[PDB]
Amino acid sequence: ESADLRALAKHLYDSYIKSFPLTKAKARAILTGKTTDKSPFVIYDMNSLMMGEDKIKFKHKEVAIRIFQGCQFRSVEAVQEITEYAKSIPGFVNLDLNDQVTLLKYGVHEIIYTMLASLMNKDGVLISEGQGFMTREFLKSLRKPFGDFMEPKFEFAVKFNALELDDSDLAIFIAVIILSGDRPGLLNVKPIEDIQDNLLQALELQLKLNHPESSQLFAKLLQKMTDLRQIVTEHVQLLQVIKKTETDMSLHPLLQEIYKD
Amino acid sequence: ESADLRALAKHLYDSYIKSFPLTKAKARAILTGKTTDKSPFVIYDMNSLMMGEDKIKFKHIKEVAIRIFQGCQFRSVEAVQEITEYAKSIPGFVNLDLNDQVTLLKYGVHEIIYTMLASLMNKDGVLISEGQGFMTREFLKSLRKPFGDFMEPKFEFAVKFNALELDDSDLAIFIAVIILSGDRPGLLNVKPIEDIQDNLLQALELQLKLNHPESSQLFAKLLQKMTDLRQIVTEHVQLLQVIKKTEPLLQEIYKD
């Protein structure tokens, strides 16, 4: 009955709020720029990067690397948050532990880039809890491996943000990503498949209710999962170019755990 | 109003049953209750464990005590989500500030676990794996220096707590009280968080008197037990970083 699926939506949207500080709704508020309750310092060249540390604090050496390093701890941080949100999906913690770990190992990137879109517009991305902004151009212009590491995310975000999803939608969508069943190494696909079937049932109703005039947003949404599986693959292989380019520069082990390609 | 308290009572009961798979009535039929319509595989020594791992379906597929500890970590993660779901049914819990909600859960979840662990225990040992198992108290004590003493003070508590002879309709209101505790560090608006508790304490108060007619002053006895929950949780939170001195994606699963 629709009555139940509305509850799973409200439930996930509540957990989504509690697991991620920077929601899409908050992100867009910062990004309009008409909302100046706090506006972001914009990094666009090396001289903004200088200032970008004067007054923006982050949790603390070529620029292109130290950017990446700070980009990397954010990744760790988002993995922590997704992990906290996953644990809230009804029945996730009831699944086999090997498969909990396997659903995370694989869904985390697809979620990371889904949510990165909330932080992006055609010109850049909010940094450091929104305190910052960093241009698509300043990113596209770092040292040669690093000068398009982050470019395709931007093209996906633009095409993905075209869906105009809000947070209540994302929360259900984020769930479906976690509970795929298509993941390699899964011990028990069918219980995963049953939760995901509920979650899709939840998504469909939500999308048709939250965006009434937007027909086949459910189908066009699900189809966006194609674009995701392809970002994830460009990323790992680009990341391997850096493990060889940068034998001196290390990689956070939690991230490493989720990269046995 | 007599009837409003009893109303919230049945609300909470109905919700606790739906949120908690293994209810105390259930647990007690299995346990010392000779309700041998089904029986749990029992773990009394090392030989029975490997037997039991092989028959029972543990959802966490490495030495003896460590494997037990992790399977314990797995159960608590599920319990948490049962507590969490249960909470959303407490009247007014959801109307709270979400930060406050997260705080009550954060600090209330251990006390609630060890409260409901009591329902799965007796002096001789404890039910495990949805009650498909029973792990004797002596086999648990018979674990390696870090691990044998982990579980003795819980068995300590359950015996005293179970002596109250509380049932699931009592534990319903009681755990609601525990959660809507307005003395948790960091809450932002303790008025509802205490307004509901004064409602909850009223309900529990009447409930105990009606279900336990001449258990004089059980309510008080049951509240002063709440000093024993805080005390254990403290000894438990302590005993979780003496083990981290011994012991990555699953580490982020179990961030305590």
Ligand SMILES: O=C(Nc1ccc(Oc2ncccn2)cc1C(=O)O)c1ccc(Cl)cc1Cl
């Ligand atoms: O830069 C990014 N993230 C961060 C990088 C550094 C950082 O700390 C920092 N900032 C500037 C310079 C050095 N370090 C914080 C973040 C963040 O997103 O939270 C980033 C975000 C999205 C995309 Cl698509 C690309 C990047 Cl390179």
Ligand SMILES: O=C(Nc1ccc(Oc2ncccn2)cc1C(=O)O)c1ccc(Cl)cc1Cl
């Ligand atoms: O056994 C307990 N928890 C579990 C530990 C392991 C486990 O899975 C398991 N069993 C045996 C060996 C290894 N792992 C399941 C449970 C459970 O409570 O459901 C337990 C329950 C109460 C108390 Cl006071 C102590 C423990 Cl150790």
Ligand SMILES: *c1ccc([N+](=O)[O-])cc1C(=O)Nc1ccccc1
């Ligand atoms: C940036 C640089 C390196 C990695 N990595 O090696 O995994 C990841 C990222 C990245 O995309 N970080 C991120 C995720 C989410 C939000 C902001 C930044």
Ligand SMILES: *c1ccc([N+](=O)[O-])cc1C(=O)Nc1ccccc1
């Ligand atoms: C067992 C081991 C570790 C923790 N911990 O990390 O805080 C907790 C527990 C525990 O008490 N598990 C449990 C809860 C509820 C029912 C059965 C078992």
